[PDB]
Structure 1
């Protein structure tokens, strides 16, 4: 007689918290969605094995349109869990699902898990210096999203870093790479011409955070735009003005050009 929103973490089934695992193991029914993000290091089977329960996977439509018809009814007389990649309430609209739970008379609890939003700390960039975030969405038809460009501009002007979540089309198995994101940004630049994103812009790419050997790379767009960062998921970051210690880390750990060590105070 309760609904748990449990995050599964960044990369594989072991990124779930012990708390989340112990609770999931005792739930009567377990649901999950895998369209908000990509866990490149595991499979449904491995997750099912770990929690020792059958997992019913829901599609975006099942959730957004029928969460209260598929999940909530069972949570009224059973302990139910709803699993999601990363943290269930980060860069998703799942928070609203707690309201549906309330109105249906179902108490809900949230169990957090490692999120890419904080995992970016592994790039060596100070977390507090990250400003507003944005998502680079695939253009479709005659529609070419550009809001993310303005976010970079606004943050950069304040000396803040910009985290760019990359698009995902789970049902089509399409995961935007940092390369594709850079290509899109260069096109927006040509259009708006704000000097925000060019071949000389310093960027940082983090691929498969959560794995033991994620790809962490820093350098100029002109040099990284055609580099292989390995399998998805990928995230792209456009740093603002760097502290010397941030630059040192990018050079030593992310292989950035040693010239960035010479910051322009």
Structure 2
């Protein structure tokens, strides 16, 4: 008689929580979307096999325009689950769907799963030091998004780290790489000339968090701009002022140049 929002986790089907799996196994109907993020280590089948149910995958349009016509009607007389990559309410507009559920007289519950937002901890950067986050969006036609550049500036001015979600166009099989993000940022810097993002800027790249062997790299843009970080998904991070131990981790674990060990306090 309820609707469950269940996160699938970072990388593969095993990133779901035990709680999420046991509840998903007993739901009458299971829906999911795979446009808000990319789970590079699994397939729909592997997820269906684990949960033991057929899964109706919905498009962005099905959800944003027809969630109350496709999913909610069933939750009024059945236990329904809506599954998503990572945590269902992180960097998505899915929270608003709980409002739609309420208006349709449907109770909803949320089962969390590991999210890229907290996975940044594996970069060695203190998570409490992250400031406002942003998304590097693909330019479209004459429209060239740039607000994410200002976020970095605002955070850097405060000595805070900046988490940059990268764009995704699932229907086009498009997943922005950290390289493409760095190129776009260099272009905005050329236009705004704020000294925010240059070839000498230290950045951190995290690719395929959740996998056992994610790619964790730190260094200057000039050096990483063309480095191969492996398959998507990727996130780009622009650190603010570093603590001694953050620099030590970036060097020992992320292969950063030993020169960043020397911090200018």
Give the TM-score taking structure 1 as reference length.
1.00
Q: Give the distance between the partners of 1:108 and 1:185, measured in 2 at CA.
A: 40
Question: How far did residue 112 of structure 1 move?
Answer: 0.2
Q: 2-side partners of 1:17 and 1:229: how far apart?
A: 28
* Deviation sequence 1:7-42 (CA, Å, 0-9, x none): 000000000000000000000000000000000000
* Matching residue of 1:195: 195
> What CA distance in whole angstroms lies between the structure 2 residues aligned with 1:247 and 1:147?
28
Query: Deviations for 1:92-119, whole angstroms, at most 9, x for unmatched residues?
Result: 0000000000000000000000000000
> Which blocks of at least 5 consecutive residues in structure 2 are unaligned?
none
Secondary structure of residue in 2 paired with 1:191: helix
Q: 2:117, 2:191 → 1: CA distance?
A: 29
Structure 1 position 140, deviation (Å)? 0.3
**d(CA) in 1 for partners of 2:259, 2:225:** 19
1:76 alignment counterpart: 76
- CA deviation digits over 1:55-102, x for unaligned, max 9? 000000000000000000000000000000000000000000000000
Count, aligned residues? 265
Hey, what's the Cα distance between the residues in 1 that align with 2:199 and 2:86? 32
> Using the alignment, how far apart are the partners of 1:186 and 1:244 within structure 2?
28
2:16 maps to which residue?
16
Does residue 125 (structure 1) correspond to residue 125 (structure 2)? The answer is yes
Q: CA deviation at 1:160?
A: 0.1
Query: How much has 1:2 moved relative to structure 2?
Result: 0.1
Q: Deviations over 1:41-64 (max 9, x none)?
A: 000000000000000000000000
Render the CA deviation track for 1:135-181: whole Å, top value 9, x for unaligned. 00000000000000000000000000000000000000000000000
Q: List alignment gaps of at least 5 residues for structure 1.
A: none
Q: Which residue of 2 aligns with 1:104?
A: 104
SS in 1 for 2:217: strand
Give the deviation of 1:131 after TM superposition: 0.1
Alpha-carbon distance, 1:132 to partner: 0.1
Moved over 4 A (4+): none
Looking at structure 2, the residues matched to 171 and 186 of structure 1 have their Cα atoms a distance apart, in angstroms, of: 27
Distance, in Å, in 2 between the alignment partners of 1:105 and 1:174 is 37
Note the C-alpha offset of 1:259. 0.4
SS of 1:227's equivalent in the other structure is coil
* Separation of aligned partners in 2, 1:262 and 1:133: 26
SS in 2 for 1:235: strand
